[PDB]
Amino acid sequence: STGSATTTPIDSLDDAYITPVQIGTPAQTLNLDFDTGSSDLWVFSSETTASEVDGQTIYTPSKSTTAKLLSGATWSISYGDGSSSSGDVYTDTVSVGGLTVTGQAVESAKKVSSSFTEDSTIDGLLGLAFSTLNTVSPTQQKTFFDNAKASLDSPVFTADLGYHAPGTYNFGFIDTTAYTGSITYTAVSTKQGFWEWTSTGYAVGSGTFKSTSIDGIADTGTTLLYLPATVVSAYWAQVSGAKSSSSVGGYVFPCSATLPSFTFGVGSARIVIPGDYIDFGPISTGSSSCFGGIQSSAGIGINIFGDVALKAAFVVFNGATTPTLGFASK
Numbered sequence: 001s002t003g004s005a006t007t008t009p010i011d012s013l014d015d016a017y018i019t020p021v022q023i024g025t026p027a028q029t030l031n032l033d034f035d036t037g038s039s040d041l042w043v044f045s046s047e048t049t050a051s052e053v054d055g056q057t058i059y060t061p062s063k064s065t066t067a068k069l070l071s072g073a074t075w076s077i078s079y080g081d082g083s084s085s086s087g088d089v090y091t092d093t094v095s096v097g098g099l100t101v102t103g104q105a106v107e108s109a110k111k112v113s114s115s116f117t118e119d120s121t122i123d124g125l126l127g128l129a130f131s132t133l134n135t136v137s138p139t140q141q142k143t144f145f146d147n148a149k150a151s152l153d154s155p156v157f158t159a160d161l162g163y164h165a166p167g168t169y170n171f172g173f174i175d176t177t178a179y180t181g182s183i184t185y186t187a188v189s190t191k192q193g194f195w196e197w198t199s200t201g202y203a204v205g206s207g208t209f210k211s212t213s214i215d216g217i218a219d220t221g222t223t224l225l226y227l228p229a230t231v232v233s234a235y236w237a238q239v240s241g242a243k244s245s246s247s248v249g250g251y252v253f254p255c256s257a258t259l260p261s262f263t264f265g266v267g268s269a270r271i272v273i274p275g276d277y278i279d280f281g282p283i284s285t286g287s288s289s290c291f292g293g294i295q296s297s298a299g300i301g302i303n304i305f306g307d308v309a310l311k312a313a314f315v316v317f318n319g320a321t322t323p324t325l326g327f328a329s330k
């Protein structure tokens with residue numbers, strides 16, 4: 001089997017991407033944030049505290065004839081963000097772009113934090129990291145990908161995020177028309193539960209490439225590119241008037257600037273992030289200070305190849321017995 005679903009930015013800054021997901025019988029379609037940095041499929045629901053729902057579409061398990069409460073199971077998760085949610089668990093039929101899983105754990109939120117409430121465009125998350133990170137207790141549950149894998153033509157999914165435009169998540173096949181040149185594969189460590197890999201270096205603008213190992217995760221659920229302080233300083237030093245602002249919470253730059261590109265290495269190959277991808281707009285409405293898309297990972301504890309980086313590539317999440325990651329230009 002295979003599936004193919006369009007992913008759409010939630011706003012003009014590509015702050016996140018939403019993908020329609022069919023849950024239950026008859027289908028209830030929710031717009032979920034596909035997150036290769038976590039491993040829980042959770043949704044806004046008829047059980048979510050009423051004051052914590054503001055515009056989202058909810059899952060109502062009592063209206064699904066295939067929903068079954070997963071007795072005694074609960075979940076609770078927090079994001080690298082600082083947000084969180086928690087609740088109980090159903091199993092139900094879940095379909096993504098024509099690919100169907102029966103018996104998927106669907107985590108029903110009873111509580112969501114304010115950032116979730118405040119974002120009416122995201123109806124929940126669909127985690128695509130390794131199932132060892134799933135938070136359901138006392139019986140941990142598998143991700144949508146892990147449940148589907150054996151049925152797929154090939155045990156892979158691909159992320160093709162757009163810049164200010166829709167893109168695609170495919171399951172079970174590699175669309176050879178969706179990238180240019182070849183896909184370069186690179187090793188993955190699953191020891192922390194993430195799609196963790198090591199970039200071979202970087203360049204800033206038309207600058208020479210610096211060969212240096214940068215360990216980090218491929219995370220569709222993170223908006224920005226978080227890299228070591230040395231790398232980030234080298235980038236922003238090429239932008240007149242750019243500065244790290246403790247009050248804003250990162251690097252800002254004059255909105256009148258033209259940003260340089262940023263290149264990262266994948267083995268001997270190179271992915272180029274155009275400068276415009278690194279502009280996240282005024283720090284506040286009407287400001288002429290703009291927020292940077294490359295930020296330091298120093299307070300975080302891990303480097304994160306978030307949407308800013310991934311959207312410059314066609315990315316293969318290879319879930320074979322030994323997982324790997326593939327990157328191509330597009």
Ligand SMILES: N=C(N)SCc1ccc(Cl)cc1
Nearest residue numbers: 037038080221222300301302
């Ligand atoms: N994508 C996700 N849900 S969490 C990403 C993240 C942020 C911080 C650290 Cl330490 C690990 C992962």
